[PDB]
Amino acid sequence: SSMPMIEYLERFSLKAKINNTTNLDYSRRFLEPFLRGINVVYTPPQSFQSAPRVYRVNGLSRAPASSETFEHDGKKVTIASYFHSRNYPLKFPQLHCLNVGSSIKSILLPIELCSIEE
RNA sequence: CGUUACGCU
């Protein structure tokens, strides 16, 4: 089985619970080194119709899902709008994302969609 | 190992 990254964080690295308002940019000093090095299972929303898959985490995104952008079909979209327009409005759009991409290629995953296999 | 393409994001 598995535990939600949201809980998993709430428990070992943060002490507090995430709410629609928490800003991880502040808990960053220790959060990132805490996260770097672990494996997570990305479970795409049911509306993506895609099988879960695993990634090594490299850290936190520099910005939250709502600010952080990438290129999709030749357009800027934030992580938040991307998930929204794929029929899954994020619960925490203000949360920073898990960075699983490499130096040349960004891949940012909303923490609510990530879990750790135990 | 490299380059495209396509996903992912």
Curated annotation (Swiss-Prot):
Residues 9-118 form the PAZ domain. It is found in: Nucleus; Cytoplasm, Cytoplasmic ribonucleoprotein granule. Residues 82-87 are annotated as: Interaction with guide RNA. Interacts with Fmr1, Dcr-1 and vig to form the RNA-induced silencing complex (RISC), a ribonucleoprotein (RNP) complex involved in translation regulation, other components of the complex are RpL5, RpL11 and Rm62. As part of the RISC complex, interacts with Tudor-SN. Interacts with Taf11. Belongs to the argonaute family. Ago subfamily. PAZ domain provides a major contribution for nucleic acid recognition. PAZ binds oligonucleotides of different lengths and has a strong preference for single-stranded nucleic acids (ssRNA or SSDNA) or RNA duplexes with single-stranded 3' overhangs. Can bind the characteristic two-base 3' overhangs of siRNAs, indicating that it may contribute to the specific and productive incorporation of siRNAs and miRNAs into the RNAi pathway. Essential for RNA interference (RNAi); double-stranded RNA induces potent and specific gene silencing. RNAi is mediated by the RNA-induced silencing complex (RISC), a sequence-specific, multicomponent nuclease that destroys or silences messenger RNAs homologous to the silencing trigger. This is Protein argonaute-2. It comes from Drosophila melanogaster.
